[PDB]
Amino acid sequence: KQAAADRRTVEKTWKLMDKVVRLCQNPKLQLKNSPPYILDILPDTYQHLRLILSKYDDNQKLAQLSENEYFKIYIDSLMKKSKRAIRLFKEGKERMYEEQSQDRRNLTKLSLIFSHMLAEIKAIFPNGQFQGDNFRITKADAAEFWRKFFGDKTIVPWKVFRQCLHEVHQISSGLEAMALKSTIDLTCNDYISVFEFDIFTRLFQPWGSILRNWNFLAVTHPGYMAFLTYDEVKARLQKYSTKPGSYIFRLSCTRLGQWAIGYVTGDGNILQTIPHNKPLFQALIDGSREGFYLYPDGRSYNPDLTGLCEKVTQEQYELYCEMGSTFQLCKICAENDKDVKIEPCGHLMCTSCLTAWQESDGQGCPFCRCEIKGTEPIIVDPFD
Ligand SMILES: C[C@H]1CCCN(Cc2cc(C(F)(F)F)c3nn(-c4cccc([C@]5(c6nncn6C)C[C@@H](C)C5)c4)c(=O)n3c2)C1
Ligand code: NA
Ligand SMILES: [Zn+2]
Ligand SMILES: [Zn+2]
């Protein structure tokens, strides 16, 4: 239960956001020219929040806004992520100036989250006016699922979303559900908004086989490159500029919900194509037949995608989860955060899973089988 999003609460996010901007303005960091551009995202976020406040310009309008379920979650997540970014500079110290450090990698993860939060607030409050209850989900079969399970809700907890999604498309394991959460929950707030749902269903359409499309195209395909700028797509394909047909497909934080396929032309140039509102697997099948998309990431084997027209190991899901912010999530249930540490081994899980485990098997830790001498409540941060 988050606090009401009153004017005072909104302004606390601006004060925390101005601190993040000040910390990121250190020339040693070189963030002025560093995508997705946190020095442009936080001012844009501030201007959007100001635009919202101007549309709810009276006591009664502000009473409606502070009670808006989506706005309350937005302000609460913005406050939490800004604080996490300040905490990152405080603990990273000199490591914040080394571009390859894990502390700078964590700053890039937060930068992507702020970029996604900005696109989300602009879609849900276009021109500063709430339109979440009138949001258009692009795929009709996806729209029918949202309306069936969540009615006119603009946002739902991940816990509820996953359970309802399982009712239509079965999720086989805790690791798969964790991998899925990092893919849909772009703002890393433990909620799925209708906007995040619309992005995921556009990327992995058609709806009828959405988890098969996601497992194949994002979890196991060697051509998948996650978020990349065009300059990184070029650097990635530059080593293979001597092999026409080499290709990769990436997401763009300035074109949410669409794919960009970068490839080597017959004359050695690197060009890109944005497929239409049609499955990515059909664009890869078409381009393969026509000799444009032959070697994913420059490698000779191009997986047979025709199966998707008419298998994933636990290790693959674990590696997929690296870029995400799911370390705080219980690996067993993939719906509650880790809040208990087993002693002496130190494995972590949620309280419900440990209780369920002690009432079921209980013959040692569920991960290492070592004798459970004790338990200890803990708080886990996604960057641990
Ligand atoms: C715009 C440029 C800026 C400079 C840096 N480069 C390279 C870069 C760097 C990072 C990092 F770690 F440093 F922050 C990174 N994190 N990240 C990512 C984060 C959360 C989830 C995801 C998904 C995913 N893709 N594979 C696994 N999963 C969980 C794709 C989603 C639908 C789910 C990805 C991603 O794409 N990153 C790409 C990008
Ligand atoms: Na979210
Ligand atoms: Zn659990
Ligand atoms: Zn253990």
Query: Closest ligand to 199 CA?
Result: 1
Q: Tell me if 93 is assigned to some domain.
A: yes
Residue 108: count of CB within 10 angstroms of its CB: 16
Token digits of residue 184:
């849909």
- Backbone torsion region of residue 334, taken as left when φ is above 0, otherwise alpha when ψ lies between -120 and 50, otherwise beta: left
Q: Round to whole Å and give the CA distance between 293 and 247.
A: 6
Q: Round to whole Å and give the CA distance between 184 and 196.
A: 6
Residue in 58, 64, 47 with CA at minimum distance from that of residue 5: 64
Q: Round to whole Å and give the CA distance between 190 and 199.
A: 16
Q: Tell me if 369 is assigned to some domain.
A: yes
Indicate the resolution in Å: 1.8
- Backbone torsion region of residue 275, taken as left when φ is above 0, otherwise alpha when ψ lies between -120 and 50, otherwise beta: beta
Residue nearest to atom 33 of ligand 1 (CA): 183
127 plus 153 within the same structural domain: no
96 plus 38 within the same structural domain: yes
Which of ligand 1's atoms lies nearest the C-alpha of 188? 20
Experimental method: X-ray
126 plus 152 within the same structural domain: no
Residue in 103, 135, 141, 121 with CA at minimum distance from that of residue 46: 121
238 plus 162 within the same structural domain: no
Q: Round to whole Å and give the CA distance between 198 and 188.
A: 16
The separation between the first and the last C-alpha atoms of the chain, rounded to the nearest angstrom, is 25
What CATH number is attached to the domain comprising 158? Answer: 1.10.238.10
Residue 30: count of CB within 10 angstroms of its CB: 10
Nearest-5° Cα angle at 226, 224 to 232 = 95
Q: Which domain holds residue 159?
A: 135-217
Cα 3 to Cα 7, 55, 66, 264: the distances in Å are: 12, 21, 9, 51
> Is beta strand 155-157 parallel, antiparallel or unpaired with respect to 259-264?
unpaired
187: CA distance to ligand 2 center in Å?
A: 4
Q: Round to whole Å and give the CA distance between 226 and 108.
A: 13
Q: Round to whole Å and give the CA distance between 186 and 195.
A: 10
270 plus 296 within the same structural domain: yes
Mutation to probe ligand 1, out of 323, 325, 328 (largest number of atoms < 8 A from CB): 323
Which of ligand 1's atoms lies nearest the C-alpha of 35? 3
Number of domains in the chain: 4
Binding site feature residues for 4-O-phospho-L-tyrosine:
250
Q: Round to whole Å and give the CA distance between 177 and 87.
A: 29
Q: What are phi and psi of 19, to 5 degrees?
A: -60, -45
Residue numbers after which the chain breaks, C to N beyond 2.5 angstroms? 310
Residue 262: count of CB within 10 angstroms of its CB: 22
Burial of 229 from C-beta contacts in 10 A (0-12 / 13-18 / 19+): middle
Q: Which residues contact 362 (CB under 8 A, 6 or more apart)?
A: 372
Q: Round to whole Å and give the CA distance between 16 and 83.
A: 7
364: CA distance to ligand 4 center in Å?
A: 8
Residue owning tokens 């990698």: 105
- Please name the amino acid found at residue 18: D
What CATH number is attached to the domain comprising 233? Answer: 3.30.505.10
What CATH number is attached to the domain comprising 42? Answer: 1.20.930.20
Residue in 115, 117, 109, 29 with CA at minimum distance from that of residue 71: 117
Which of ligand 1's atoms lies nearest the C-alpha of 326? 29
- The domain boundary, picked from 302, 319, 342, lies at 302
372: CA distance to ligand 4 center in Å?
A: 8
Q: Round to whole Å and give the CA distance between 308 and 212.
A: 7
207 plus 243 within the same structural domain: no
The strands making up 340-343's β-sheet, listed across from edge to edge, are: 348-349, 340-343, 374-377
324: CA distance to ligand 1 center in Å?
A: 7
Nearest-5° Cα angle at 383, 381 to 384 = 75
98 plus 145 within the same structural domain: no
Residue in 145, 148, 123 with CA at minimum distance from that of residue 134: 123
- Chain-centroid distance, C-alpha 155: 15
- Please name the amino acid found at residue 72: K
- Chain-centroid distance, C-alpha 114: 11
**3-state secondary structure string, the chain?**
CCCCCCHHHHHHHHHHHHHHHHHHCCCCCCCCCCCCCHHHHHHHHHHHHHHHHHHCCCHHHHHHHHHCHHHHHHHHHHHHHHHHHHHHHHHHHHHHHCCCCHHHHHHHHHHHHHHHHHHHHHHHCHHHCCCHHHCCCCCHHHHHHHHHHHCCCCEEEHHHHHHHHHCCCCCCCHHHHHHHHHHHCCCCCCEEEHHHHHHHHHHCCCHHHHHHHHHHHHHHCCCEEEECCHHHHHHHHHCCCCCCCEEEEEECCCCCCCEEEEEECCCCCEEEECCCCCCHHHHHHHHHHCCCCCEECCCCCCCCCHHHCCCCCHHHHHHHHCCCCCCCECCCCCCCECCEEEECCCCEECHHHHHHHHHHCCCCCCCCCCCCCEEEECCCCCCC
Q: Round to whole Å and give the CA distance between 169 and 172.
A: 10
Burial 303-334 (b: 16+ CB within 10 A, else e): eebeebeeebeeebbeebbeebbbbbbbbbbb
| Number of residues in the chain | 384
